């Protein structure tokens, strides 16, 4: 899914759906993860 | 009460209001040790997970097979390192399997 329609998906769940931090990737958008320009080994 | 499934694990007696627990009664699969019809016709039965010549093993209750002290590269598998066979001297004997002949290699630092 795209980051535009994410919120449509208690208060904590609402916050996570909305997202103070939103990142868009090939595997759809994710919330709660800070995106960096660094790079590490897969975790 | 109940177990992981809907089967009842415990019940309260409606007459005396006493607690009780229920367990399925003695059951299990049954197998038989046969050395081959074309070589004999006696057979020794084995109850897989029941508590009981007669003989007891970690693999179940084996009757009709006579225990013997020593061990041989075993013919057929019973379980828990116990095998049986019509060898030895005209009946099924159940023993503990032997792995191989002892062989201490004569090791020394200059040989």
């Amino acid at each position: 899914v795209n980051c535009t329609e994410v919120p449509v998906a208690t208060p904590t769940w609402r916050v996570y759906s909305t997202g103070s931090n939103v990142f868009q990737t090939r595997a759809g958008c994710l919330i709660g993860a800070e995106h960096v320009n660094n790079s590490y080994e897969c975790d | 009460g109940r177990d992981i499934a809907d089967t009842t694990d415990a019940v309260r007696d409606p007459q005396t209001l006493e607690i009780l627990d229920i367990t399925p009664c003695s059951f299990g699969g049954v197998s038989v040790i046969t050395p081959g019809t074309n070589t004999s016709n006696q057979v020794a039965v084995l109850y897989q997970d029941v508590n009981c010549n007669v003989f007891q093993t970690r693999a179940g209750c084996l009757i009709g097979a006579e225990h013997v002290n020593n061990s041989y590269e075993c013919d057929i598998p019973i379980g828990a390192g116990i095998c049986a066979s019509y060898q030895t001297s005209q009946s099924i004997i159940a023993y503990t399997m032997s792995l191989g002949a002892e062989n201490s290699v004569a090791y020394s630092n200059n040989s």
């Binding site: - | 992981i4 499934a5 598998p77 390192g81 792995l99 191989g100 002949a101 201490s104 290699v105 630092n109």
Partner: protein
């Protein structure tokens, strides 16, 4: 060319699940629950019960076949000598420890205590493995004592003793490092070996995930069993999930359809379990076959297959049992402290092009030397040490130099 001046002997663990629990379920009990008035109906579905029981029994015997193939590689069991003078190598961490009621090794004990699953239900049962953990440990001890005390010979004929420093000299020579590298550093080698071996224990104690490849297997089986038994709670569209309720509330002519729904649902669930178990048993059989191949080609010998036995050049691997699996401590010689010299493909003496016999030409800036390809050990370049072929005009990268003729001084002295 950059070639090593030092080495490190590193032992790396490799886990391999060789078998799984021998579960069996009697279709009749699981589906009907000992309700004869329901077994009579189940009999109308054909030979499904017999087929499922046959499949599960096949998997059960295949597990014991897997264990037999992987571990029972030796026709006879060997006993390590009482005296433990292996030339400085210290195997106390892999060999069985008599100081415990069980005949395991400290690594084996730690390995076994780090994997964990009495539960009984209706129909489901588990058969004990053919080779009890004590017997698997005895087989492992046999293989381990054989490899320590008789090199690789015990796996391909009679057990021919050989002093362990000499055995490791042979194993070194098997990877292109001359024998004199080992003896002249024997003590050092031993220390590294010992250290590495000790280190492995801490690694097994480092995280719970070390035994993951085994744990997963167990977990998977458990999951399946759970989701099978839990399927008895579902009713599959009937009016109740318990056959007793059906037969107590409804008369036979009407209860027949509800029992039909329950029979169909239970049979489908058990069929799904059996098929998943067949796939999983095929995967475990492949893993056990790979484990048997590793035990045959690594413990009983020394493989040129580059990464079959962990990073580095394989020297020897000692097996260790583990609950439903095996663990190999692949010992590997790994180069280190590489120094880079200038190199040439061939030297010239009097127009004759000398190529190294087995080593390689390397120059420490000033004059050349011949050194084996995996451990910097410069030797004066001599006609005995390097062979001849062709002449100057053909090779590209040739470098002028003088190759010592070993007979010149004696020839001059005696003529």
């Amino acid at each position: 060319i950059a070639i090593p001046t030092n080495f490190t002997i590193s032992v790396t663990t490799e886990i391999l699940p060789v078998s799984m629990t021998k579960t069996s379920v009697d279709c009749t009990m699981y589906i009907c629950g000992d309700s004869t008035e329901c077994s009579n109906l189940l009999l109308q579905y054909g030979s499904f019960c017999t087929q499922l029981n046959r499949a599960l029994t096949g998997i059960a015997v295949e597990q014991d076949k897997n264990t037999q193939e992987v571990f029972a590689q030796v026709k006879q069991i060997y006993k390590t000598p009482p005296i433990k003078d292996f030339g400085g190598f210290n195997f106390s961490q892999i060999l069985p420890d008599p100081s415990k009621p069980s005949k395991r090794s400290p690594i084996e004990d730690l390995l076994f205590n780090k994997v964990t699953l009495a539960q009984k239900f209706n129909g489901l049962t588990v058969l004990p493995p053919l080779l009890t953990d004590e017997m698997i440990a005895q087989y492992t001890s046999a293989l381990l004592a054989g490899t320590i005390t008789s090199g690789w010979t015990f796996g391909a004929g009679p057990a021919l003793q050989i002093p362990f420093p000499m055995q490791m000299a042979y194993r070194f020579n098997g990877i292109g490092v001359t024998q004199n590298v080992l003896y002249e550093n024997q003590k050092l080698i031993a220390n590294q070996f010992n250290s590495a071996i000790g280190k492995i224990q801490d690694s097994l104690s480092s995280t719970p995930s070390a035994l993951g490849k085994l744990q997963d297997v167990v977990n998977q089986n458990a999951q399946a069993l759970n989701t099978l038994v839990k399927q008895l709670s579902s009713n599959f569209g009937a009016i109740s999930s318990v056959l007793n309720d059906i037969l107590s509330r409804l008369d036979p002519p009407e209860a027949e359809v509800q029992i039909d729904r329950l029979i169909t649902g239970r049979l489908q669930s058990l069929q799904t379990y059996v098929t998943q178990q067949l796939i999983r048993a095929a995967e475990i059989r492949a893993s056990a076959n790979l484990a048997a191949t590793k035990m045959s080609e690594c413990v009983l010998g020394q493989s040129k297959r580059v990464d079959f036995c962990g990073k580095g050049y394989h020297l020897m691997s000692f097996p260790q049992s583990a609950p439903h699996g095996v663990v190999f401590l692949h010992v590997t010689y790994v180069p280190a402290q590489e120094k880079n010299f200038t190199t040439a493909p061939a030297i010239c003496h009097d127009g004759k092009a000398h190529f190294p016999r087995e080593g390689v030409f390397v120059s420490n800036g000033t004059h050349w030397f011949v050194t084996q390809r995996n451990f910097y050990e410069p030797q004066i370049i001599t006609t005995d040490n390097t062979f001849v072929s062709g002449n100057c005009d053909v090779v590209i990268g040739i470098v002028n130099n003088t190759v010592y003729d070993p007979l010149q001084p004696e020839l001059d002295s005696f003529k």
